[model samples]
Target chain A: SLNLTIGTSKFNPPFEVWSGNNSSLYGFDIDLMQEICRRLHATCTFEAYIFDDLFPALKNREVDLVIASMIITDERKKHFIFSLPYMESNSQYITTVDSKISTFDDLHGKKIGVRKGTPYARQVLSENRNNQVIFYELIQDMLLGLSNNQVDASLMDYEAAKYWMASEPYAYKLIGKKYKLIGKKISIGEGYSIMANPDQFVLIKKINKILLEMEADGTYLRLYSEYF
Target chain B: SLNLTIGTSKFNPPFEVWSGNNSSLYGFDIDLMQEICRRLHATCTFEAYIFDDLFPALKNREVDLVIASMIITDERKKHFIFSLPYMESNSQYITTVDSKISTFDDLHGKKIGVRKGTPYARQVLSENRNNQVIFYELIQDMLLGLSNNQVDASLMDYEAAKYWMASEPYAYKLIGKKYKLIGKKISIGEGYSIMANPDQFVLIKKINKILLEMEADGTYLRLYSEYF
Candidate 1:
């Protein structure tokens, strides 16, 4: 049987959630990877790393692939191979329900929290130079920072932000409309996809074919509903 | 400067068409590749090969890539990497204007001509156990066979067939609605894309990004209108 190792962030609910005992992982990314492994007739082991280190792990061959809800960007494509996008990616700003920041225009001159090493963070920085950008190591910490007033608001993935607003006890509320970051060099409209080393073309192609098959057979829809 | 040698079939019009002097090639696929090469700051040389020989040429590194209006299928993905689809692919049947083959139902027990090394050929054979499938080396020959009454009808790429009906002085007419060949092992719904060897992951990723950029910048629409 074929064996595979997948790398992902340690936290990030609805995408990757580690067991309380630290013995296993489960979430959308985990489940999706499991299903892909099943179709490939391969056995998979999951490894957790800090978000910033995941790509390094893949590059070092510490893992065979990464399904960390990573968005495909032109800059990243320069160093890695990505499968076709498996999820739509968009961003939203979140603040306390009573905050005066209701529009993007209000974000100027305010402090914002963003997860480290994500397109959302870079986008938040590039949106306005007058804004103060606070970086957090994880989504939970970023949301907590927003709750503790360390930052006036936090910009994050729309789906993950919505999940936090519904599942966490914070008084977080999404502000403004969901939007995509379309840059001249690093657009985030392509969405989240699995990533691999540049040499893993054969494996990436198989995963792409299986991903298309999942979409055709309704498995993708079923999994999306189960998670989001 | 980077130099790219692209391999394509010698005679697929609207996708790949040789100039009358045989000094150059020009068509949709040729134009698209030229634009891609321009963006890469690379010079490209076009090489002609029969349909059956393009992939082997790519495999042997005789050509850096193949942009032959080739459809992406699971069977091909096993050994090749494909860029994001550049065109939608579907098939139609063409017969003499006076032929009685107006619908798919009229195709039973009839002699059908298909290009030799295409999914269409395999699809015709798998479609009906009783249908007589005639294989031709090129689209021109296949259509000639149909015109000469050697085959009752010919099945080919819808866009190419439509081009033939309009450009060539033949009394050929398309019969039946255009349909995609959706097989359990080889579906043609994914459309045509550039093909590279399994090891050229970096090159394929660059092409995929450029393709998306082309679609975003109105360049793709301009080129499509120029030919189609």
Candidate 2:
């Protein structure tokens, strides 16, 4: 039987889900890799790593593939071979409902907060260089920044924004569109794909077939509705 | 609000699922239609009818689209336009585990039972004109024919075969792989799609977009694994 080592990260609700005991993990990405392995008649063993450590883990041959909620970027293309995107992600603009920021154009002079070290943070910061932009280490903190009047709005993944808004005092609402940055509509976000080592072309191809079939059969749609 | 009507058929396990008293329906097709409606930000109404009634129901404008595991055949193509296939289905030959009919060639001079009024029945009867072929009005009868040694084997849809086998007393196993009639390997089943009236081209276009996005994301995959 083929035994695969999958690398992933811990998160809550939507992405990779884990427990305090580290006994098991579950979520969209994890479920996808597991299904792929099942279809290939392989045994899958998953290892939890911080998001930043996932790349090096694969590079070091410590893992066969990485299933973190990672976006395919041009810069990362050289280091890993990716399966065709399995998920679509976009940045959502969440603001206090009473704020007059109903559209992307209304963000002028508005204070925005984003999670530090994320693509959303980078894109928004680069686009609104002169505006009052703040970065927080966690999504909760950035969302809190908006509630505390520290920022008038926040830019985050649509899934994450929806996740946070689904709970609590309901102080914010996502505009009817995705965030636009620096003359580009990042509303379509980017595709999230599984990454294999540079020489693991065969594994990537096998995974891709399963991914495509799953899409055709409605497995992906079920997971998105369940988690996202 | 975009309110649309979807037609489906009732059964157990694999495709259309429901309980007593017409309370609700849940399964692969139902779930896919629900998710499509959710994404389109539209309200959906589903109607259950006999398989034979689905097409005429669409032609009469009784339903906007039909999702009853209806295959896109050349004949049906003349009557209705179909969305891209959301799932693929094929037939399988099933027999008792101890039977020697593991391959299609082994069926020479053997009796094979198939449900009447299905493509599988038509294909098998046409290809095995010189052999002892039997047809029954129900899947249970066809499957029972094999169980009681009335038929050497039975041919049924891969989904139905798997569904029935799950509840059987471990009496049968799907032989080799998908059933193949004649010389060519018809292993790849037609992609099942939503069928709309010819004049409802706009609705077909919108539904296709939703299906494509679901495929691009892993939504289709998750649903397939869950139901199929």
Candidate 3:
């Protein structure tokens, strides 16, 4: 197989991200990606940029493939080509304790928050019965705003929600929260190792063969348990 | 041909949503619904329910038709019959002028806010790249949250965003500054009236006939120009 360029954003963890600096290069997924490449008799390298940049860069030929852990969705499928999922997850909805907004209708004619240019934006647009919506450029700011009591509520995946609540008990709470887990083993589905070039079907199929062996030998599970 | 029970939410000013004392339904769609019923020689009545309850009620036979200002999306299209949109519009994202959050990546690890159970919730969740997403159950609470500077950014659609941002200066700003309209003309696509009851197909056809006439004579436009 020819060379493949892999890209990822820094915000995600345990997944392959970053520009291969000391702080970048190699995580659970990266390890698996590298091993898979070896089994396929191919060599690969890793690089990182802002997490969000991964998609655009891949599209622009900045990277040949991205093995980073990125959950696949209908919207994202439009931009990048993905490998079969090797992980699973669900997201959570967060709010302040004792808040009156218990259900969806409460959002009408009111301000809601979100990051710019994602599938979630569509949700906000579709739900506003009275036509109120907002967009933020960065995810960190949205988290900071929630802790500061900036907006009424925040929405995120169940795992990240659990991480924040567990990691920062001094600040946030689940509060009148709602959680949804879509389908099963379907992997909420996990972010895949995507290929920038569809023409690399031969290389992908070879990797797929190795991944199958890895999965059978519990390689994915052993590697994943280290991070989770 | 049959006693058709068309479903509608409480009377709102521009569409069939909640309004003062819940009586004077002044929106373009409501008037259009009434005209369609009159044209069919089949009388219709308003079933005042929470906006969320309309679809369930329709399925339960609590109502035979739905005629709110609801835009028919592909998601909803799978569940029920819809009419050709008599009106056209879109959903948008906003941010305040003073906010420092300038990009989607900025929202990473930040608290972004939204309404509970709203499409915005999905939008925020998807666009956010897995950030801390918050939710408010009611419009008033979300507005209050933003006014208090509790959110990093807020989201809402065209009319209400314009109304609130213009009316309330003590809090909130338009992030992303404007909406990115995604879909084709939204509103009752494929025809809203007479769609629910196959028994009423004859009446539906008749009403569509009237709608076509109304559309041609500019009557529909004069009656429903506010949403555009």
Best by lDDT: 1
DockQ of each: 0.06, 0.15, 0.01
What's the distance in Å from true for residue A151, model 1?
10
Give one digit per residue, the lDDT tens place, for model 1 in A128-171: 65778888987778767776788888877766766765644453
Clashes of 2: 16
lDDT of candidate 2 over B26-143, digit per residue (tens)? 7778888999998988888888875666767888989888887776666778878887667665667777766776677777777878665456656676766456678776555666
lDDT by residue (A96-142, candidate 2, tens digit) is 55555667777777778876534665666577645576877655566
Cα deviation at B197, candidate 2, in Å, is 2.0
lDDT of 1 by residue, B94-148 (tens): 7776677766777788898988777887777777647888989877788778778
Error of 2 at A21 (Å): 50
TM-score of every candidate relative to the true structure: 0.56, 0.48, 0.40
- The CA lDDT at B159 in model 2 is 72
Best by DockQ: 2
Off by over 4 Å in 1: A1-228, B20-22, B170-189
Greater DockQ among 1 and 3 belongs to: 1
Which of the predicted structures, 1 or 3, would earn the higher TM-score when compared with the native? 1
